[PDB]
Design a protein around this ligand. Sequence first.
Ligand code: NA
Lengths: 147, 147
Amino acid sequence: SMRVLFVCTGNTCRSPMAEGIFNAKSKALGKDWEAKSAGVFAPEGFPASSEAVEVLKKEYGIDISDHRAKSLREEDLKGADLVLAMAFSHKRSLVSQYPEYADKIFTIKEFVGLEGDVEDPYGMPLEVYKKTAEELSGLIDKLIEKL
Amino acid sequence: SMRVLFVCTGNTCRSPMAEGIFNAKSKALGKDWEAKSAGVFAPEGFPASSEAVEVLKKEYGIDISDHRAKSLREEDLKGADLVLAMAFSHKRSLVSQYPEYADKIFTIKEFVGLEGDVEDPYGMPLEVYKKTAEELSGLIDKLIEKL
Ligand code: NA
Protein backbone atom coordinates (compact mmCIF):
# COMPACT_ATOMS: atom_id res chain seq x y z
CA SER A 1 0.00 0.00 0.00
CA MET A 2 2.73 2.47 -0.94
CA ARG A 3 3.32 2.90 -4.67
CA VAL A 4 1.38 2.92 -7.93
CA LEU A 5 3.27 3.16 -11.23
CA PHE A 6 1.85 4.82 -14.35
CA VAL A 7 3.49 3.79 -17.62
CA CYS A 8 3.12 5.17 -21.14
CA THR A 9 5.34 5.44 -24.23
CA GLY A 10 7.83 8.32 -24.19
CA ASN A 11 7.18 9.12 -20.52
CA THR A 12 6.91 12.82 -21.39
CA CYS A 13 3.15 13.43 -21.30
CA ARG A 14 0.47 11.05 -19.97
CA SER A 15 2.24 9.00 -17.27
CA PRO A 16 4.15 11.96 -15.82
CA MET A 17 0.89 13.96 -15.89
CA ALA A 18 -0.97 11.25 -13.97
CA GLU A 19 2.02 11.01 -11.63
CA GLY A 20 1.83 14.65 -10.59
CA ILE A 21 -1.94 14.53 -10.23
CA PHE A 22 -1.83 11.39 -8.06
CA ASN A 23 0.95 12.60 -5.76
CA ALA A 24 -0.60 16.02 -5.17
CA LYS A 25 -4.06 14.59 -4.50
CA SER A 26 -2.75 11.86 -2.20
CA LYS A 27 -0.55 14.23 -0.19
CA ALA A 28 -3.61 16.42 0.33
CA LEU A 29 -5.59 13.41 1.52
CA GLY A 30 -2.99 12.13 3.98
CA LYS A 31 -3.14 8.86 2.07
CA ASP A 32 0.03 6.76 2.14
CA TRP A 33 0.14 6.19 -1.61
CA GLU A 34 2.77 7.77 -3.85
CA ALA A 35 3.17 7.59 -7.62
CA LYS A 36 6.01 7.49 -10.14
CA SER A 37 6.17 7.10 -13.91
CA ALA A 38 8.08 5.15 -16.55
CA GLY A 39 7.90 4.56 -20.30
CA VAL A 40 8.06 1.46 -22.49
CA PHE A 41 10.18 3.41 -24.98
CA ALA A 42 11.44 6.45 -23.11
CA PRO A 43 14.02 9.02 -24.25
CA GLU A 44 16.00 9.08 -21.00
CA GLY A 45 17.44 12.54 -20.27
CA PHE A 46 14.34 14.41 -21.40
CA PRO A 47 11.97 16.58 -19.31
CA ALA A 48 8.17 16.38 -19.38
CA SER A 49 6.70 18.26 -22.32
CA SER A 50 6.37 22.01 -21.72
CA GLU A 51 2.76 21.55 -22.78
CA ALA A 52 2.19 19.14 -19.89
CA VAL A 53 4.07 21.33 -17.40
CA GLU A 54 1.85 24.29 -18.24
CA VAL A 55 -1.56 22.62 -17.93
CA LEU A 56 -0.88 20.97 -14.55
CA LYS A 57 0.25 24.28 -13.05
CA LYS A 58 -2.41 26.46 -14.67
CA GLU A 59 -5.33 24.10 -14.00
CA TYR A 60 -4.28 22.53 -10.69
CA GLY A 61 -1.30 24.45 -9.32
CA ILE A 62 0.78 21.28 -9.69
CA ASP A 63 4.46 21.51 -10.61
CA ILE A 64 6.19 18.65 -12.45
CA SER A 65 9.33 20.50 -13.55
CA ASP A 66 11.59 17.81 -12.06
CA HIS A 67 10.21 14.96 -14.18
CA ARG A 68 12.85 13.19 -16.23
CA ALA A 69 11.68 10.43 -18.58
CA LYS A 70 12.71 6.97 -17.41
CA SER A 71 12.79 3.59 -19.12
CA LEU A 72 10.72 0.96 -17.32
CA ARG A 73 12.87 -1.56 -15.46
CA GLU A 74 11.84 -4.83 -13.82
CA GLU A 75 12.63 -3.11 -10.53
CA ASP A 76 9.86 -0.53 -10.86
CA LEU A 77 7.54 -3.48 -11.37
CA LYS A 78 9.05 -4.98 -8.20
CA GLY A 79 8.68 -1.86 -6.07
CA ALA A 80 5.11 -1.12 -7.14
CA ASP A 81 1.92 -2.45 -5.58
CA LEU A 82 0.09 -1.53 -8.77
CA VAL A 83 1.04 -0.84 -12.38
CA LEU A 84 -1.35 1.20 -14.52
CA ALA A 85 -1.10 1.44 -18.31
CA MET A 86 -2.11 4.61 -20.15
CA ALA A 87 -3.32 2.48 -23.06
CA PHE A 88 -4.34 -1.11 -23.76
CA SER A 89 -1.28 -1.38 -26.00
CA HIS A 90 0.84 -0.46 -22.98
CA LYS A 91 -0.90 -3.19 -21.00
CA ARG A 92 -0.36 -5.54 -23.94
CA SER A 93 3.41 -5.06 -23.89
CA LEU A 94 3.78 -5.23 -20.10
CA VAL A 95 2.69 -8.87 -19.86
CA SER A 96 5.51 -9.43 -22.39
CA GLN A 97 8.24 -7.20 -20.98
CA TYR A 98 9.00 -8.27 -17.43
CA PRO A 99 8.20 -11.95 -16.59
CA GLU A 100 4.68 -11.32 -15.52
CA TYR A 101 3.03 -9.98 -12.48
CA ALA A 102 0.02 -9.56 -14.79
CA ASP A 103 -2.02 -9.74 -11.59
CA LYS A 104 -0.94 -6.15 -10.84
CA ILE A 105 -0.86 -4.70 -14.35
CA PHE A 106 -4.05 -3.04 -15.58
CA THR A 107 -5.00 -0.15 -17.81
CA ILE A 108 -6.02 2.83 -15.67
CA LYS A 109 -9.55 2.94 -17.12
CA GLU A 110 -10.27 -0.78 -16.74
CA PHE A 111 -9.07 -0.84 -13.13
CA VAL A 112 -11.58 1.91 -12.40
CA GLY A 113 -14.66 0.81 -14.33
CA LEU A 114 -14.49 1.72 -18.04
CA GLU A 115 -12.66 0.57 -21.18
CA GLY A 116 -10.57 2.50 -23.69
CA ASP A 117 -7.35 4.50 -23.94
CA VAL A 118 -6.00 7.75 -22.50
CA GLU A 119 -5.59 10.33 -25.23
CA ASP A 120 -1.93 10.84 -26.22
CA PRO A 121 -1.76 14.64 -26.48
CA TYR A 122 1.79 15.03 -27.84
CA GLY A 123 1.93 17.62 -30.62
CA MET A 124 -1.54 18.95 -29.79
CA PRO A 125 -2.75 22.43 -28.75
CA LEU A 126 -3.36 23.43 -25.13
CA GLU A 127 -7.06 22.55 -25.12
CA VAL A 128 -6.73 18.84 -25.88
CA TYR A 129 -3.93 18.84 -23.30
CA LYS A 130 -6.49 20.34 -20.92
CA LYS A 131 -8.89 17.52 -21.76
CA THR A 132 -6.10 14.98 -21.24
CA ALA A 133 -5.17 16.46 -17.86
CA GLU A 134 -8.84 16.71 -16.96
CA GLU A 135 -9.61 13.16 -18.08
CA LEU A 136 -6.66 12.00 -15.98
CA SER A 137 -7.71 13.85 -12.82
CA GLY A 138 -11.20 12.35 -12.99
CA LEU A 139 -9.87 8.82 -13.41
CA ILE A 140 -7.50 9.42 -10.52
CA ASP A 141 -10.39 10.63 -8.31
CA LYS A 142 -12.11 7.24 -8.48
CA LEU A 143 -8.81 5.29 -8.25
CA ILE A 144 -7.76 6.80 -4.88
CA GLU A 145 -11.34 5.96 -3.83
CA LYS A 146 -10.45 2.33 -4.54
CA LEU A 147 -6.90 2.82 -3.27
CA SER B 1 -2.95 -3.66 -0.35
CA MET B 2 -6.10 -5.73 0.20
CA ARG B 3 -5.78 -7.20 3.69
CA VAL B 4 -5.77 -5.56 7.11
CA LEU B 5 -5.47 -7.69 10.26
CA PHE B 6 -7.10 -6.45 13.46
CA VAL B 7 -5.59 -7.96 16.61
CA CYS B 8 -7.37 -8.58 19.90
CA THR B 9 -6.45 -10.61 22.96
CA GLY B 10 -9.24 -13.15 22.56
CA ASN B 11 -10.77 -12.05 19.24
CA THR B 12 -14.29 -11.76 20.67
CA CYS B 13 -15.04 -8.06 21.20
CA ARG B 14 -13.02 -5.28 19.53
CA SER B 15 -11.35 -7.12 16.63
CA PRO B 16 -14.61 -8.63 15.34
CA MET B 17 -16.16 -5.17 15.71
CA ALA B 18 -13.23 -3.36 14.10
CA GLU B 19 -13.31 -5.91 11.29
CA GLY B 20 -17.08 -5.69 10.99
CA ILE B 21 -17.63 -1.97 10.47
CA PHE B 22 -14.43 -1.59 8.41
CA ASN B 23 -15.83 -3.95 5.78
CA ALA B 24 -19.24 -2.27 6.01
CA LYS B 25 -17.46 1.01 5.27
CA SER B 26 -15.23 -0.73 2.73
CA LYS B 27 -18.44 -2.07 1.18
CA ALA B 28 -20.14 1.33 0.92
CA LEU B 29 -17.12 2.94 -0.71
CA GLY B 30 -15.77 0.94 -3.63
CA LYS B 31 -12.57 -0.06 -1.85
CA ASP B 32 -10.22 -2.97 -2.54
CA TRP B 33 -9.53 -3.52 1.16
CA GLU B 34 -10.67 -6.35 3.43
CA ALA B 35 -10.50 -6.91 7.18
CA LYS B 36 -9.65 -9.99 9.22
CA SER B 37 -9.36 -10.63 12.96
CA ALA B 38 -7.30 -12.68 15.41
CA GLY B 39 -6.44 -12.90 19.11
CA VAL B 40 -3.07 -13.21 20.83
CA PHE B 41 -4.55 -15.83 23.14
CA ALA B 42 -7.99 -16.63 21.73
CA PRO B 43 -10.03 -19.77 22.45
CA GLU B 44 -11.09 -21.04 19.02
CA GLY B 45 -14.73 -21.58 18.06
CA PHE B 46 -16.10 -18.74 20.17
CA PRO B 47 -18.50 -16.27 18.53
CA ALA B 48 -18.23 -12.51 18.94
CA SER B 49 -19.85 -11.36 22.19
CA SER B 50 -23.62 -10.93 22.03
CA GLU B 51 -23.26 -7.30 23.13
CA ALA B 52 -20.81 -6.62 20.30
CA VAL B 53 -23.19 -8.42 17.94
CA GLU B 54 -26.16 -6.34 19.11
CA VAL B 55 -24.39 -2.99 19.43
CA LEU B 56 -23.14 -3.37 15.86
CA LYS B 57 -26.55 -4.53 14.65
CA LYS B 58 -28.59 -1.71 16.21
CA GLU B 59 -26.16 1.16 15.68
CA TYR B 60 -24.55 0.44 12.30
CA GLY B 61 -26.69 -2.29 10.75
CA ILE B 62 -23.79 -4.72 10.43
CA ASP B 63 -24.15 -8.31 11.62
CA ILE B 64 -20.88 -10.13 12.49
CA SER B 65 -23.06 -13.08 13.60
CA ASP B 66 -20.87 -15.43 11.55
CA HIS B 67 -17.61 -14.53 13.31
CA ARG B 68 -15.71 -17.17 15.26
CA ALA B 69 -12.72 -16.59 17.55
CA LYS B 70 -9.39 -17.51 15.96
CA SER B 71 -6.00 -17.64 17.69
CA LEU B 72 -3.26 -15.91 15.70
CA ARG B 73 -0.92 -18.14 13.69
CA GLU B 74 1.67 -17.55 10.98
CA GLU B 75 -0.90 -17.78 8.18
CA ASP B 76 -2.58 -14.49 9.11
CA LEU B 77 0.57 -12.39 9.52
CA LYS B 78 2.12 -13.32 6.17
CA GLY B 79 -1.09 -12.67 4.25
CA ALA B 80 -1.53 -9.30 5.96
CA ASP B 81 -0.32 -6.15 4.23
CA LEU B 82 -1.03 -4.33 7.48
CA VAL B 83 -1.81 -5.55 10.99
CA LEU B 84 -3.41 -3.24 13.55
CA ALA B 85 -3.60 -3.99 17.28
CA MET B 86 -6.32 -2.54 19.50
CA ALA B 87 -3.80 -1.98 22.29
CA PHE B 88 -0.06 -1.47 22.72
CA SER B 89 -0.05 -4.76 24.61
CA HIS B 90 -1.20 -6.70 21.55
CA LYS B 91 1.32 -4.81 19.44
CA ARG B 92 4.24 -5.54 21.76
CA SER B 93 3.33 -9.22 22.11
CA LEU B 94 3.43 -9.56 18.33
CA VAL B 95 6.66 -7.62 17.65
CA SER B 96 8.59 -9.36 20.44
CA GLN B 97 7.65 -12.77 19.07
CA TYR B 98 7.49 -11.79 15.40
CA PRO B 99 10.41 -9.49 14.56
CA GLU B 100 10.65 -8.21 10.96
CA TYR B 101 6.93 -8.75 10.70
CA ALA B 102 7.17 -5.68 12.92
CA ASP B 103 7.40 -3.42 9.86
CA LYS B 104 3.67 -3.89 9.27
CA ILE B 105 2.71 -4.11 12.95
CA PHE B 106 1.18 -0.99 14.48
CA THR B 107 -1.42 0.02 17.06
CA ILE B 108 -4.89 1.11 15.92
CA LYS B 109 -4.36 4.62 17.34
CA GLU B 110 -0.69 5.12 16.44
CA PHE B 111 -1.28 4.26 12.78
CA VAL B 112 -3.67 7.20 12.42
CA GLY B 113 -1.23 9.46 14.26
CA LEU B 114 -2.90 9.18 17.67
CA GLU B 115 -1.96 7.50 20.95
CA GLY B 116 -3.61 5.10 23.38
CA ASP B 117 -5.56 1.86 23.25
CA VAL B 118 -9.14 0.82 22.54
CA GLU B 119 -10.17 -0.65 25.88
CA ASP B 120 -11.85 -4.03 26.44
CA PRO B 121 -15.65 -3.80 26.85
CA TYR B 122 -15.52 -7.25 28.53
CA GLY B 123 -18.79 -7.75 30.43
CA MET B 124 -19.41 -4.02 30.37
CA PRO B 125 -22.86 -2.42 29.89
CA LEU B 126 -23.98 -1.79 26.29
CA GLU B 127 -23.11 1.91 26.55
CA VAL B 128 -19.46 0.90 26.93
CA TYR B 129 -19.79 -1.40 23.92
CA LYS B 130 -21.49 1.54 22.23
CA LYS B 131 -18.68 3.96 23.10
CA THR B 132 -16.09 1.44 21.89
CA ALA B 133 -18.03 1.02 18.65
CA GLU B 134 -18.04 4.79 18.07
CA GLU B 135 -14.29 5.12 18.64
CA LEU B 136 -13.64 2.20 16.29
CA SER B 137 -15.92 3.70 13.64
CA GLY B 138 -14.10 7.01 13.95
CA LEU B 139 -10.63 5.46 13.85
CA ILE B 140 -11.50 3.27 10.87
CA ASP B 141 -12.68 6.41 9.05
CA LYS B 142 -9.13 7.76 9.37
CA LEU B 143 -7.77 4.30 8.53
CA ILE B 144 -9.66 4.04 5.23
CA GLU B 145 -8.45 7.46 4.07
CA LYS B 146 -4.82 6.64 4.88
CA LEU B 147 -5.10 3.26 3.16
NA1 NA C 1 -6.39 3.40 -20.31
